[PDB]
Design a protein around this nucleic acid. Structure first.
Ligand SMILES: [Cl-]
Ligand SMILES: [Cl-]
Ligand SMILES: [Cl-]
Ligand code: NA
Ligand code: NA
Ligand code: NA
Length: 323
DNA sequence: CGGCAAT
DNA sequence: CGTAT
DNA sequence: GCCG
């Protein structure tokens, strides 16, 4: 199979869930130690298993597979033979991993901040609440709605939110469209947030749209916290409500297919796609466009299909970008 | 060994 | 530093 | 951690 994740279809569900989940724990643990190189490899190795057409049953089936060296193969070997991987289980139990994972999942908290808190003796959320003086407003909101934000967002929630966003956007700018992106566009049934991409058919009209959208959303009393906009929405529930992370992104229609591709993901898929573009095609890709450094020109795109064709890749629908 | 996406 | 895919 |  191809070495780049953007060269292979990766469905949301596959046939090596257990194996890939173990490797991603090591990737997650690697990122907690600042080992971005090791995180990347373990992520790649896990994605390879996701792309396989059938379960891995023997170690010999790992031969030839990209990004599977000594360490990753050792992990799979133990899992196939003993049902568990000793290193993986040791990571799970450790106070370091559980704390870092707990801290980093807080909105407004990254690895660097989490590590510093761990080195100061902080272990729980109430520890962070015990000293609100050294908390930023984004972190204060992160701890404030942490329980709700830790609750999976369902498809039914997305539909309600999109109906809300479309209403505000529509009143903010006639003709402006709202596109669901993120993991939910890839076909996920549950998520930790909702991502929307907003544009307008007439180039330039999308300028200064977000403040108008946010104002009309706040007027409806739907914003607990907030061109991009990282918001925490108040989502109506049966007899109550819960907080939901929502991201609003505005782009000109000329750059829309690039913004759509980037914000649909997955994270690893986009990294592999941009790595492929530069290393194999000598082209520079981001959320805004595709640049030819030699010709000093930007590729024009009307769709995601255009971009894939520019890069010489077979088209992959969003539901096959779950790398 | 240098690179690892990109803003 | 944080945020997004 | 893996790759060229
Ligand atoms: Cl590393
Ligand atoms: Cl899902
Ligand atoms: Cl498109
Ligand atoms: Na976080
Ligand atoms: Na998001
Ligand atoms: Na998301």
């Amino acid at each position: 199979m191809p070495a780049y994740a953007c060269q292979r279809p990766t469905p949301l569900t596959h046939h090596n869930t257990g194996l890939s989940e173990a490797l991603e724990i090591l990737a997650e643990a690697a990122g907690f130690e600042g080992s971005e190189g090791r995180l990347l490899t373990f992520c790649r190795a896990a994605s390879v298993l996701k792309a396989l057409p059938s379960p891995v049953t023997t170690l010999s089936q790992l031969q030839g597979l990209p990004h599977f060296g000594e360490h990753s193969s050792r992990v799979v070997q133990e899992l196939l033979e003993h049902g568990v991987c000793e290193e993986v289980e040791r990571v799970r139990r450790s106070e370091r991993y559980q704390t870092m994972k707990l801290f980093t999942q807080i909105f407004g908290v990254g690895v660097k901040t989490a590590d510093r808190w761990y080195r100061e003796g902080l272990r729980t959320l109430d520890d962070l609440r015990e000293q609100p003086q050294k908390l930023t407003q984004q972190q204060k909101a992160g701890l404030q709605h942490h329980q709700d934000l830790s609750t999976p967002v369902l498809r039914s929630d997305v539909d309600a939110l999109q109906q809300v966003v479309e209403e505000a956007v529509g009143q903010a700018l006639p003709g402006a469209t709202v596109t669901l992106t993120g993991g939910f566009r890839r076909g996920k049934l549950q998520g930790h947030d909702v991502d929307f991409l907003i544009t307008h058919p007439k180039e330039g009209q999308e300028a200064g749209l977000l403040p108008r959208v946010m104002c009309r959303l706040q007027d409806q009393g739907l914003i607990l916290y907030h061109e991009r906009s990282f918001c925490i929405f108040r989502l109506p529930q049966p007899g109550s409500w819960k907080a939901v992370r929502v991201d609003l992104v505005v782009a000109p229609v000329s750059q829309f297919p690039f913004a759509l591709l980037g914000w649909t993901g997955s994270k690893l898929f986009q990294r592999e796609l941009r790595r492929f573009s530069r290393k194999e095609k000598g082209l520079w890709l981001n959320s805004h466009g595709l640049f030819d450094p030699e010709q000093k020109t930007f590729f024009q795109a009307a769709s995601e299909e255009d971009i894939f064709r520019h890069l010489g890749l077979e088209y992959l629908p969003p539901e096959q970008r779950n790398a």
